[PDB]
Amino acid sequence: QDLEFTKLPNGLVIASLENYAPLSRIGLFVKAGSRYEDSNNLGTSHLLRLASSLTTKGASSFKITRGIEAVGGKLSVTATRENMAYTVEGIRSDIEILMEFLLNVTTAPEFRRWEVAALRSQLKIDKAVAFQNSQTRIIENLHDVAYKNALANPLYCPDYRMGKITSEELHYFVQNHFTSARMALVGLGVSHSVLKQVAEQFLNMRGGLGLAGAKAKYRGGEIREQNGDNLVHAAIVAESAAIGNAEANAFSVLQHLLGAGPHIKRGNNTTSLLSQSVAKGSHQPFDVSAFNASYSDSGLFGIYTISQAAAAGEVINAAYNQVKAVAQGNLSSADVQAAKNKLKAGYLMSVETSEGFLSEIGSQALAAGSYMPPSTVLQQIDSVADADVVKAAKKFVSGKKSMAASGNLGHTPFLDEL
Amino acid sequence: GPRYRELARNWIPTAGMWGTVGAVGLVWATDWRLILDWVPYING
Amino acid sequence: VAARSGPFAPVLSATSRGVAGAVPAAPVLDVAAARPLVATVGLNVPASVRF
Amino acid sequence: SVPETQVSILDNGLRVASEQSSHATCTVGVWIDAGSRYETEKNNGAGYFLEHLAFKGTKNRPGNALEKEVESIGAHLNAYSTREHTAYLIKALSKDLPKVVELLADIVQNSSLEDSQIEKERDVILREMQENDASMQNVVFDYLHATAFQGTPLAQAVEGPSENVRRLSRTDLTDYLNRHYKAPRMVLAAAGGVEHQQLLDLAQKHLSSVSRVYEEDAVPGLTPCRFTGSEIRHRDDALPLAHVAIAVEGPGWANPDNVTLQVANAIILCQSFQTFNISYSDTGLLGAHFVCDAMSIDDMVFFLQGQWMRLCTSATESEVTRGKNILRNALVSHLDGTTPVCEDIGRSLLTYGRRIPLAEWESRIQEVDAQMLRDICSKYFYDQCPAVAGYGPIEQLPDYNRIRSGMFWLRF
Amino acid sequence: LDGFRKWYYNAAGFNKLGLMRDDTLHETEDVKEAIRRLPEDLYNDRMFRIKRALDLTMRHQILPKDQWTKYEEDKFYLEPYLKEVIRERKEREEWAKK
């Protein structure tokens, strides 16, 4: 059948699709990302993300682990700067107790102090594993230098805050952001009725709208961290459109025009106006792409470069110059059509998997409360037109930039030189 | 418990064997001729 | 830095004495692209970042 | 209610299989029964270097023409090579189904190996091999394959020795291409929003005339390998962590107790500790890959060994039920996504000769109980000589007598 | 029964060393898990009370009668934390049994 939606009077969104899949998935989406913290409770969302298997009021930890592993189901937590999503999946004959476990975890945690004291070492280990690659550190640095208050908060807990996050901070964060008006329960392979009926046992406790988050403010700035990696990972971004604004799409078409990354393995070359503009001048190994991250109040669009330290300068300059050409109208309609085809194929392959489909429905729910059929999107992306793309470009080419650099930065330029 | 019982089964033959080995060894070393007088060749 | 800094001097002058609270004893883990990071952690599924 | 995988066969011999689903992002993919097992130590990197070069240049699409086309519809182009199979797959939209198939046709035949391109790749491959050593678990699994299949074509690696990589001739490659790219050893697999009749038409037009006749009847043939229990201990104490893999001989693709062995893996200290059932044809390696600090490898080995014996001697129904549930969630399906379903078909037509449906997998899972699990585990784990591969600070890793002897419980 | 329990509390004699009832529990595995889950201030008071009782037993003295632990006042602090340890312990045991 099709997707089916009810908005409950306490604000909770219920979305269901019964496709008679052998494995069914059920996720719950909360507007409780890392942007809702301030300087007093930094890293609380990271410990909340890692605290999904802790003794809940309804279920002891042993059960919340042995019962999910007994049926072979999976419980995972995915977190962005805006949204958290707790997802369970398993055989249709066990999703009743899977919803019991998931809704107990979402609605009634206990946050015992010895459990979080044991979890803080896992928090440190998870942060080290996450920052084992340079991209993660350079994107966290880029957000920290790009924004002032809201979206500048890191996804991972700072080093000083380990050992300082308490049970009361987790309880305050849950009581202020895990309310029914900020939650959508989305189920693929289940009946809508049960979701409605599992939305009453729980998700009825907190009916508020939660403690809304401050508006994110852009700051600009360039940060460089000599780390030794032969490769100077450099991200240069500027402020862009919010998710909803039409301009948004234009920026997605602009990143797929300026390269969206590789499309071929071990042979991903000349796949980008950027890649072409770098490769016509530099014979060193490189990786240049376009970065776009848009959140419900603000967006970042820019370029991302990995290169040998020595060439790091002009490669960045070459990439920047290519965007300036797009800001001068130097583009062809066939290139924009190919960018639109790449963007729509990427969207369809993102929603072709079950967990990606459940995430998409989830995001749409929290964002606009409505489901937008894949088809609808296709015609809206088509709405974006050439001039629109050019426009977004000039926004980037003019707006104050924010630069995060890492590596041997002896030949990496600055923003006033860039 | 139910599970523990299953474990027992798997070890029952094993225990029997070891017990059997014990029995055999005991008789052999002890030189007990009562039981041994009941074996075809060694008897004597 | 005698007349220029004064009180701020000791901040710009290492002074290892060479010859002639104290420091309190001041990790190895198991083992590109562009897109907003999205951290993931699972009950049993190992964590991951799909940037 | 899962749609069946329909298989047809073309005169050439290539099997143009397919599958269909509401999805609209199909993954078309050519699988070839050609890997490092079919190489004869004089062309040990031919499949890898053809994989690196196949995408870069085809006769009809000169230079980087193909990679442009693939960009024009926004499709994704991937390829991989194992010791037994090679795959070239494209993720695209449904409406771009014909041209994608035509693109795949060029990639398998009419491909052009530019001697220049050959050279550029040589650099890429050599350098990576020169940096591949960085990935320890890859080093440990290559060491395990080498010491377990000593003297056979299964010891070598997909990459091959540096020498073979340096020395490669358009002609050598041409041979591997003309020898191991036969039409009866090829499957055209499609998953997602594809029609089987349209794919069968496209198959003939673009993928017909695929070679099928070998040269001077140099029809390849294969060797049943030997599992030589042995160890390899690459000691390098400067590394922070140690990677240790211990395996025994696996049954193969066609032996059904694999399913039972998978349940045993689903039943199973030192950081990462993953169990594995590498299963090549006519042999495989059941086992474990545990990383660990130098001071705990010893204990880990014991723990691992302990677990195995427990599975040979004291398996209960509850852990068997848990392992069956864990296995039944590794079922690959449309919800797993096209590429995964795509891949299965190709591997199922290459290995089993047919696509095993998920209902048959569920039947073979539910027939597994605790008694046959401990019987099959005693058949494959108990009192067997393992292959051991260690890399890192592995001095406290026990030698071969302690490992082998630990494989038998004096109490049974 | 209440008065006879007070008389037995006086006859037990750990109140004369200033100890609580939960200080006198034998540290098994469950008791050590319950002690580890205590907050820092309660743990520090428990360790000081145990050290003072050991010092008084060393000198073969007791506290003055105004400093003894009144039966009514004794607080069973470890008890709440202990029950949980036992509950969790049993749950785990049952799971294995089954």
Curated annotation (Swiss-Prot), chain A:
Protein name, as recorded: Cytochrome b-c1 complex subunit 2, mitochondrial
A single GO BP: cellular respiration
Annotated GO CC locations: mitochondrial inner membrane; mitochondrion; myelin sheath; nucleoplasm; respiratory chain complex III
Principal place of residence: mitochondrion
GN (gene name): Uqcrc2
Keywords: Acetylation, Electron transport, Membrane, Mitochondrion, Mitochondrion inner membrane, Phosphoprotein, Respiratory chain, Transit peptide, Transport
Gene3D superfamilies the UniProt entry points to: Metalloenzyme, LuxS/M16 peptidase-like (3.30.830.10)
Role of this protein: Component of the ubiquinol-cytochrome c oxidoreductase, a multisubunit transmembrane complex that is part of the mitochondrial electron transport chain which drives oxidative phosphorylation.
Organism: Mus musculus
Tissue specificity note: Expressed in neurons and astrocytes of the cerebral cortex and hippocampus (at protein level).
Residues with the N6-acetyllysine modification: 31, 164, 215
Family in the record: Belongs to the peptidase M16 family. UQCRC2/QCR2 subfamily.
Modified residues annotated as Phosphoserine in this record: 333
Entry-linked PROSITE patterns: INSULINASE
Swiss-Prot record, chain B:
Transmembrane segments: 11-32
Compartment(s) where it occurs, according to its Swiss-Prot or TrEMBL record: Mitochondrion inner membrane
Membrane topology type: Single-pass membrane protein
Mitochondrial intermembrane side: 33-44
Main location: mitochondrion
Record family assignment: Belongs to the UQCR11/QCR10 family.
Protein's job: Component of the ubiquinol-cytochrome c oxidoreductase, a multisubunit transmembrane complex that is part of the mitochondrial electron transport chain which drives oxidative phosphorylation.
Identification of the protein by name: Cytochrome b-c1 complex subunit 10
Source organism of this protein record: Mus musculus
Recorded name of the encoding gene: Uqcr11
Full-sequence portion shown in this chain: 7 to 50 of 56
Swiss-Prot record, chain C:
Part of the intact protein present: 4 to 78 of 274
Superkingdom, taxonomy of origin: Eukaryota
Complex and partners: Component of the ubiquinol-cytochrome c oxidoreductase (cytochrome b-c1 complex, complex III, CIII). Subunit 9 corresponds to the mitochondrial targeting sequence (MTS) of Rieske protein UQCRFS1. It is retained after processing and incorporated inside complex III, where it remains bound to the complex and localizes between the 2 core subunits UQCRC1/QCR1 and UQCRC2/QCR2.
Protein name (Swiss-Prot/TrEMBL): Cytochrome b-c1 complex subunit 9
Organism (species): Mus musculus (Mouse)
Function according to Swiss-Prot or TrEMBL: Component of the ubiquinol-cytochrome c oxidoreductase (cytochrome b-c1 complex, complex III, CIII). UQCRFS1 undergoes proteolytic processing once it is incorporated in the complex III dimer. One of the fragments, called subunit 9, corresponds to its mitochondrial targeting sequence (MTS). The proteolytic processing is necessary for the correct insertion of UQCRFS1 in the complex III dimer, but the persistence of UQCRFS1-derived fragments may prevent newly imported UQCRFS1 to be processed and assembled into complex III and is detrimental for the complex III structure and function.
Protein encoded by which gene: Uqcrfs1
Curated annotation (Swiss-Prot), chain D:
UniProt modified residues of type Phosphoserine: 169
Tagged with keyword Phosphoprotein: yes
Cellular compartments per GO CC: mitochondrial inner membrane; mitochondrion; myelin sheath; respiratory chain complex III
Topology versus the membrane: Peripheral membrane protein
Tissue: Expressed in neurons and astrocytes of the cerebral cortex and hippocampus (at protein level).
Coiled coil residues, start to end: none
Gene3D superfamilies the record matches: Metalloenzyme, LuxS/M16 peptidase-like (3.30.830.10)
Major subcellular location class: mitochondrion
MF-aspect GO terms: metal ion binding; protein-containing complex binding; ubiquitin protein ligase binding
Keywords in alphabetical order: Acetylation, Electron transport, Membrane, Mitochondrion, Mitochondrion inner membrane, Phosphoprotein, Respiratory chain, Transit peptide, Transport
Superkingdom classification of source: Eukaryota
Subunit details: Component of the ubiquinol-cytochrome c oxidoreductase (cytochrome b-c1 complex, complex III, CIII), a multisubunit enzyme composed of 11 subunits. The complex is composed of 3 respiratory subunits cytochrome b, cytochrome c1 and Rieske protein UQCRFS1, 2 core protein subunits UQCRC1/QCR1 and UQCRC2/QCR2, and 6 low-molecular weight protein subunits UQCRH/QCR6, UQCRB/QCR7, UQCRQ/QCR8, UQCR10/QCR9, UQCR11/QCR10 and subunit 9, the cleavage product of Rieske protein UQCRFS1.
Protein's name according to its UniProt entry: Cytochrome b-c1 complex subunit 1, mitochondrial
Protein species of origin: Mus musculus (Mouse)
